[PDB]
Symmetry: D2
Subunit: 106 residues, 4 copies
């Protein structure tokens, strides 16, 4: 899909997890975030369309999604062990990424 669409999914499902109650809501939100993150991974942001597909900036932008995807799956690891509260905490801690990448490329 489209990069701003992916970011909406990321942000909505982030708030679903905060308000979630059971383990199925959390696990399904995290699944949607993973899918969106993997979709964004191949997009070119506005402020980088001038640079080369193989530039260090583009590499760095993609690395931001690699990191986020790992964190989302580390949260899925916890939720699939039944530790729903610890998975919600991990989803909160994810924030350091959405903000590091925004500061540079949003």
């Amino acid at each position: 899909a489209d990069l701003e669409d992916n970011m909406e999914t990321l942000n909505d499902n982030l708030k679903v997890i905060e308000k979630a109650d059971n383990a199925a809501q959390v696990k399904d939100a995290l699944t949607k975030m993973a899918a969106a993150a993997a979709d964004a991974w191949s997009a070119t942001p506005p402020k980088l369309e001038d640079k080369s597909p193989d530039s260090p900036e583009m590499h760095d932008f993609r690395h931001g999604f690699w990191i986020l995807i790992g964190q989302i799956h580390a949260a899925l690891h916890l939720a699939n062990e039944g530790k729903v509260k610890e998975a919600q905490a991990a989803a909160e801690q994810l924030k350091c990424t959405c903000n590091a990448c925004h500061q540079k490329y949003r």
Copy 2:
């Protein structure tokens, strides 16, 4: 879906990656493998039907999918940087995780 269905999707797209020609081909297979692996993550294999869901055996079973998905996303990292031959070798290498879990639980 079924654990067996997930395993069929993993096996099929592994073969696709070994025969692919273009990066978009390798990229779509890895993406399907990641989803199948995430869905398999929650399953109980027959050999463990009797164990408690919080036993170490189920913990260890789920860890296999966590390591597998991490390897799939590392291959996706190479694919999305354009390095298709490297992604294909990455897909080849992750058969150590397939074989390790099969020896234990298949």
Copy 3:
């Protein structure tokens, strides 16, 4: 060093982190655990000395340390951001690994 020595380091520093107060104690304990885990990674446990260096069992044993090392560094990630309490939680959650691997190879 020696595998039982590494396990002592792992277990001691695990309890240092629980009792820790500031961010330097936690970060230094986690550093020692990482070093021990990386040292154990190349050892052969008692109950596996019969099998081949390249057997799926040996692969699986090493994968256990790869996983643990990642978790320790995910905890270092948090401690280096100043989130000492969240790093202590992550060190607690590490437990699913020490127990999954013990159940199989200890």
Copy 4:
């Protein structure tokens, strides 16, 4: 140690890995690179002396070492399975992380 000292250790052992012949050689270099990277993790680069330690810029700076150490341990995974040529190619590939952080903060 100094950030500059850590960078020198990283650079030196990268060269060692490209010229190595035996697995023990590749394994010791990666191990030294992992320690240098963990020690660099806490440093402040000159370009960021003015930013707050909890700014997104420092978060992003520290994330670079987290991704780098993950890549180093993935190469160590191959090395400890005996696949030295694969570990050497893994070391080669992680220069994307070197170049990405240098473009931003060196």
